[PDB]
Design a protein around this motif. Structure first.
Motif, short mmCIF file in Angstrom:
data_model
loop_
_atom_site.label_atom_id
_atom_site.label_comp_id
_atom_site.label_asym_id
_atom_site.label_seq_id
_atom_site.Cartn_x
_atom_site.Cartn_y
_atom_site.Cartn_z
N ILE A 1 0.83 -1.19 0.00
CA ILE A 1 0.00 0.00 0.00
C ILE A 1 0.88 1.27 0.00
O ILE A 1 0.59 2.22 -0.71
N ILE A 2 1.94 1.25 0.80
CA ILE A 2 2.94 2.31 0.86
C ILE A 2 3.57 2.53 -0.53
O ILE A 2 3.75 3.68 -0.96
N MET A 3 3.85 1.45 -1.25
CA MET A 3 4.38 1.56 -2.61
C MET A 3 3.40 2.26 -3.54
O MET A 3 3.77 3.17 -4.31
N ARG A 4 2.13 1.86 -3.47
CA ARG A 4 1.10 2.47 -4.30
C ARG A 4 0.91 3.96 -3.99
O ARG A 4 0.74 4.77 -4.89
N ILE A 5 0.93 4.31 -2.72
CA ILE A 5 0.81 5.71 -2.34
C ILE A 5 1.98 6.49 -2.89
O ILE A 5 1.80 7.56 -3.44
N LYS A 6 3.17 5.93 -2.73
CA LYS A 6 4.39 6.62 -3.14
C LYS A 6 4.38 6.93 -4.63
O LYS A 6 4.79 8.00 -5.06
N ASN A 7 3.86 6.01 -5.43
CA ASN A 7 3.85 6.21 -6.87
C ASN A 7 2.93 7.35 -7.28
O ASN A 7 3.01 7.83 -8.39
#
Length: 143
Positions: free
Chosen positions: A54-60
């Protein structure tokens, strides 16, 4: 501070859909035209399970040059742990964002947060976009 932005009603609408109806996994908000906080992105994939994912998706969805508010329903195991969902509020404020914007976002943050009940933790992250992912994880994991 006392700068001049207000909060759009869709904002709370979507947060409530996240908090109560669990139809959103995260919401990213922004200040549009310097005077209205609005929904920028909604993740509807209620089948997103990994924290790191989820952190990866937010970061993108973030950039080194613009501030955002993020609300995320983070899947977090107790010290047991049975995955309990916790609501995090994140103020993304990177160094390369222009000052006019940095100050406005900071001065407006309260206007948003005070409408958002049920937050497990409110965070401010100001690192480089390259460390966003590691820093948020470190924060989340160090209680």
């Amino acid at each position: 501070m006392v700068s001049g932005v207000n909060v759009s009603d869709e904002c709370i609408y979507e947060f409530n859909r996240l908090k109560v109806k669990h139809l959103n996994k995260y919401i990213i908000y922004k200040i549009e035209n310097l005077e209205k906080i609005v929904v920028d992105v909604l993740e509807h994939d209620m089948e997103l399970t990994s924290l790191d994912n989820i952190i990866m998706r937010i970061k993108n969805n973030l950039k080194n040059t613009e501030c955002r508010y993020i609300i995320a329903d983070m899947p977090i195991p107790t010290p047991e742990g049975v995955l309990r969902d916790r609501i995090y509020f994140i103020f993304w404020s990177p160094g390369l964002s222009k000052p006019k914007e940095k100050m406005l976002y900071a001065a407006s943050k309260e206007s948003l947060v005070r409408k958002i009940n049920g937050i497990f933790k409110s965070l401010e992250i100001t690192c480089d976009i390259n460390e966003f992912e590691e820093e948020l994880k470190a924060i989340i994991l160090n209680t």
